[PDB]
Amino acid sequence: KRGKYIRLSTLYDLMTQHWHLKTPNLVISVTGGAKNFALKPRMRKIFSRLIYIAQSKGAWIFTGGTHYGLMKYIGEVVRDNTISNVVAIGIAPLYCLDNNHTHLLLTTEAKVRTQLEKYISERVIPESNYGGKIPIVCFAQGGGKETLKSINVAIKSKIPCVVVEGSGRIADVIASLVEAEGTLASSCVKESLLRFLPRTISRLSEEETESWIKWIKEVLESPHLLTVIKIEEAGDEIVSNAISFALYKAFSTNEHDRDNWNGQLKLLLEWNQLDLASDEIFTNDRNWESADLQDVMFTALVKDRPKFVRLFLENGLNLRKFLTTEVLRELYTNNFSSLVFKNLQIAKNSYNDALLTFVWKMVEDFRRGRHPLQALFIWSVLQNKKELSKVIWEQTRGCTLAALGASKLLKSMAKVKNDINAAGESEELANEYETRAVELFTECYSNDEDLAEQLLTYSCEAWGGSNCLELAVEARDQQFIAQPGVQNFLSKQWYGEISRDTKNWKIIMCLFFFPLIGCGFISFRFLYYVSFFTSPFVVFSWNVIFYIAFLLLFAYVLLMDFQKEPTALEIILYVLVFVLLCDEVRQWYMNGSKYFSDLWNVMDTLAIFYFIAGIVFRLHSDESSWYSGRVIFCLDYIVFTLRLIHIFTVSRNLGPKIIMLQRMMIDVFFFLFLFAVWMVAFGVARQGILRKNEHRWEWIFRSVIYEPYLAMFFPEWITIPLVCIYMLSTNILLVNLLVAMFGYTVGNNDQVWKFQRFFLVQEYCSRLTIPFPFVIFANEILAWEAVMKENYLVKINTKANDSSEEMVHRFRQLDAKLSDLKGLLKEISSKIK
């Protein structure tokens, strides 16, 4: 729709006050009305990165606004960036106008264009990044007389830097006449420009062709205003590597900023020029006190310059002193994206955990109003700052802990389906913090194990309120828990103070004979009995041994005993069931109404509440309910044995088979549910066909459920589709049987069961450490892993060997060596003349 045009033969105020904003940058593309322009894949990429740079910095792009070649391509990339701001101001047998430039200002036109861009270079700006002065860059890529005087009237009149590149007619000439000092090279303009564009010279006079030598040689009077985008730069970020190096040349060669090292820094920080700021600013010949490196640091954090945050820290900057109380609150509401904070609302409400509630409250108390480094780390983790958060992680104190808390915080924010691009990136970043915490902890465990396991259970000083183990189970970090350091820790927490090298049977035979513990039979690590009978392998072995002897005594009570009076056997049957209930109520904490959602732990409570009702029917003294108190004991005897069968089932397949099992358990429960649905519908069909048509009660609703199980434990033409029922009901129920068989397969497999073997054993170790009959009777290590982190960061940094075998340093280290041989060849010719 839009596009403004002004016929023209003082100007700048009629477009910054009436129309639009201010310029942090200003690019000049000069080709002129070249009706042909060979757009390669390279030149299509150079002038597409350039408009993205002008989109980022907010520049004006002055060019000739006619619909030909580059200037129609520059215009159509501008509307591509307004589809996915850029102000492409245009100034111009006959050319047609370009319908893609934002403002039009239409040979005869290249004087008002110069005297405008020479005025914007003249300005003084109180924002003052480039010493004020509004950075002007002039590109050049093609040939002709017009683009030659455009480089002239830029460089000669004022100081805008000019960038050329080696693909074109005369921009390849000046790309060849800059790697040469020949005392201005008075006729090498003729020795160039003819052998690389031979048809333009035989179209005009000699006195103007020599004027082109006068044109070119006054460009080269200042080679600090001439950057060349060379051809071998086959990579991204080479336009901004040339624009910033052109702006750094024109700024630093003002002969006024010798005391102004900071203005060179903020320029080289806005562009991502790390390898230029390291060797031209931080070289210890320049005098800085590392005290004014703080406002430059706060800009390196908010604009996401991760390589500059790392450079400021390794040149001396105490990040603990820098992160004051108000810098964190100029960072959590000023520089916090609201799309993440809106996504932080949905994660806190829909998938709520204990870590998120600390994170949601610590985001809030900074946007409403002490571990400062671990607040900057969460700030750069929530916003998916991929490489800034890797710099702050290396400065934290609890580094294995914060690598797991970040890996949990991202894994919860990637459970939100509000945007699967942000939820796909943060899941990917969480999978490389869990990997970051594996290989840091295997570095900690390759040192002494007593310190690395001191670190697993560190009290966190309220990081999230949990140690590294608790923060890894809730994140379901299967790679952190399947590592051999954590598995060795759990197998020592389960074997207890008994050594794991004694034997397996040697522990069991000490239960049946107590005086074998006091000898040198077991090789544990004065009253070793309180150490033997507190290890949860012995507590589990005694509880199963007690539970079998409880079932062999409940079998004697049921058959031989139980005449009419609850004699001395049946009273202690309450007391053994009472400690099977007293431990359940003391484990009835931490349930959340989801502990009973597994059909083997609600079965435990429903086996006692179906047994307590057997003590109710016991103490009624009538034969009509004494026998009803026996059939509810005999039915409950099978429930107590299936729990023993389930204990033997889990404790034998506690390994690689614990994933196949307990997935097949809920797959057979679904088949038995579908079989119960079919037996109900078979019961209605069998009751509706047979007799007693209308003679009914609530007899029916209690028989139809059970009549097919009593059936388990007129043929006119309907008998043939009765078989088609038994060819359909057999098919849909056998498929549910085979889905139960093979459903464990479909759906890295070592870390799946090692997480489950960890999660089940730590669930049992979180019970009481005393056996069944006796339930009624009841910053020095953070400094160590800071050493272990620096040893680890050396490992991953010197793994750049297959990138060191990429010889891009060796492809160019002999270019300096062949030019060392080149220049000595030339000067020895000058002596013998």
Ligand X SMILES: CC(C)CCC[C@@H](C)[C@H]1CC[C@H]2[C@@H]3CC=C4C[C@@H](OC(=O)CCC(=O)O)CC[C@]4(C)[C@H]3CC[C@]12C
Please say whether the beta carbons of 550 and 544 come within 8 A.
no
Q: Which residue in the set 333, 541, 687, 762 belongs to the binding site for ligand X (CB under 6 A)?
A: 541
Least CB distance to ligand UND at residue 610 (A):
20
Taking CB under 8 A as the rule, does residue 727 contact its own copies? yes
* CA nearest neighbour of 419 among 332, 525, 342: 342
Task: Identify which of residues 82 and 597 has a Cβ nearer to ligand UND in the complex.
Answer: 597
Cα dihedral 213, 218, 222, 223, rounded to 10, equals: -20
Task: Identify which of residues 393 and 540 has a Cβ nearer to ligand X in the complex.
Answer: 540
Structure tokens at 309: 């945050």
Give the contacts of 8 (CB within 8 A, at least 6 positions apart).
Answer: 105, 106, 112
Taking CB under 5 A as the rule, does residue 642 contact Na ion? no
* CA nearest neighbour of 793 among 346, 443, 281, 309: 443
Taking CB under 6 A as the rule, does residue 651 contact ligand 9PE? yes
553 binds, among ligand 9PE, its own copies, ligand X, none (CB under 5 to 8 A by kind): none
Give the contacts of 135 (CB within 8 A, at least 6 positions apart).
Answer: 24, 25, 26, 247
Least CB distance to ligand UND at residue 643 (A):
19
Taking CB under 6 A as the rule, does residue 675 contact ligand UND? yes
Please say whether the beta carbons of 468 and 458 come within 8 A.
yes
Taking CB under 6 A as the rule, does residue 651 contact ligand UND? no
Spatial distance between the Cα atoms of 819 and 174, rounded to a whole number of angstroms: 20
643 binds, among ligand LQ7, ligand X, ligand 9PE, none (CB under 5 to 8 A by kind): ligand LQ7
763 binds, among ligand X, ligand LQ7, ligand 9PE, none (CB under 5 to 8 A by kind): ligand LQ7
Least CB distance to Na ion at residue 357 (A):
47
Taking CB under 6 A as the rule, does residue 651 contact ligand X? yes
Least CB distance to ligand 9PE at residue 505 (A):
7
Taking CB under 8 A as the rule, does residue 695 contact its own copies? no
Spatial distance between the Cα atoms of 562 and 597, rounded to a whole number of angstroms: 35
Which residues would be at the binding site for ligand LQ7 (CB under 6 A)? 540, 543-544, 547, 580, 584, 601, 604, 607, 640, 643, 647, 650, 763-764
Count Cβ atoms below 10 Å from residue 245 Cβ, excluding itself.
17
Give the contacts of 201 (CB within 8 A, at least 6 positions apart).
Answer: 193, 194, 209
Number of alpha carbons in the 13 Å side-chain half-sphere of residue 139: 31
Stretch that binds ligand X, among 371-379, 537-545, 612-620, 701-709 (CB under 6 A): 537-545
Taking CB under 6 A as the rule, does residue 732 contact ligand UND? no
**Residues between 500 and 529 that touch ligand 9PE (CB under 6 A):** 504
Please say whether the beta carbons of 402 and 396 come within 8 A.
yes
Phi, psi of 62 (to 5 degrees): -80, 130
Structure tokens at 687: 């009751």
The full DSSP string for 465-492 is SS-TTHHHHTTT-HHHHSSHHHHHHHHH
- Here's the x/- map for ligand X, 761-780, by CB under 6 A: it reads as x-------------------
Task: Identify which of residues 539 and 632 has a Cβ nearer to ligand X in the complex.
Answer: 539
Structure tokens at 728: 């359909």
Least CB distance to its own copies at residue 657 (A):
5
Taking CB under 6 A as the rule, does residue 513 contact ligand UND? no
Please say whether the beta carbons of 242 and 137 come within 8 A.
no
What radius of gyration, in Å, describes the C-alpha atoms of the chain?
A: 41
Task: Identify which of residues 638 and 776 has a Cβ nearer to ligand 9PE in the complex.
Answer: 638
Taking CB under 8 A as the rule, does residue 702 contact its own copies? yes
83 binds, among its own copies, ligand LQ7, ligand X, none (CB under 5 to 8 A by kind): its own copies
Q: Which residue in the set 560, 568, 571, 783 belongs to the binding site for its own copies (CB under 8 A)?
A: 560
Spatial distance between the Cα atoms of 406 and 423, rounded to a whole number of angstroms: 14
Stretch that binds ligand UND, among 52-60, 147-155, 503-511, 647-655 (CB under 6 A): 503-511
* CA nearest neighbour of 212 among 162, 180, 181, 177: 177
Q: Which amino acid is at 767?
A: R
Task: Identify which of residues 84 and 284 has a Cβ nearer to its own copies in the complex.
Answer: 84
Task: Identify which of residues 569 and 674 has a Cβ nearer to ligand UND in the complex.
Answer: 674
Q: Which residue in the set 9, 504, 593, 749 belongs to the binding site for ligand UND (CB under 6 A)?
A: 504
Taking CB under 5 A as the rule, does residue 544 contact Na ion? no
Please say whether the beta carbons of 403 and 433 come within 8 A.
yes
Q: Which residue in the set 276, 508, 733, 775 belongs to the binding site for ligand X (CB under 6 A)?
A: 508
Query: Angle 343-349-354 (CA atoms, 0-180°, nearest 5)?
Result: 105
Spatial distance between the Cα atoms of 452 and 215, rounded to a whole number of angstroms: 72
Task: Identify which of residues 38 and 420 has a Cβ nearer to its own copies in the complex.
Answer: 420
Mapped onto helix, strand or coil, the DSSP state of residue 165 is strand
Spatial distance between the Cα atoms of 423 and 416, rounded to a whole number of angstroms: 7
Number of alpha carbons in the 13 Å side-chain half-sphere of residue 361: 8
Spatial distance between the Cα atoms of 495 and 505, rounded to a whole number of angstroms: 13
Task: Identify which of residues 178 and 639 has a Cβ nearer to ligand 9PE in the complex.
Answer: 639
Please give the DSSP secondary-structure letter assigned to residue 395: T
Least CB distance to ligand 9PE at residue 469 (A):
22
- Here's the x/- map for its own copies, 76-95, by CB under 8 A: it reads as ----x--xx-----------
Q: Which residue in the set 327, 551, 700, 733 belongs to the binding site for Na ion (CB under 5 A)?
A: 733
Stretch that binds ligand UND, among 354-362, 366-374, 730-738, 799-807 (CB under 6 A): 730-738
Q: Interface residues with ligand X (CB under 6 A)?
A: 491, 494, 508, 540-541, 544-545, 548, 651, 654, 761
Q: Interface residues with ligand UND (CB under 6 A)?
A: 504-505, 508-509, 512, 675, 726, 730, 734, 737
Q: Interface residues with ligand 9PE (CB under 6 A)?
A: 504, 548, 551-552, 641, 648, 651-652, 654-655, 677, 680-681
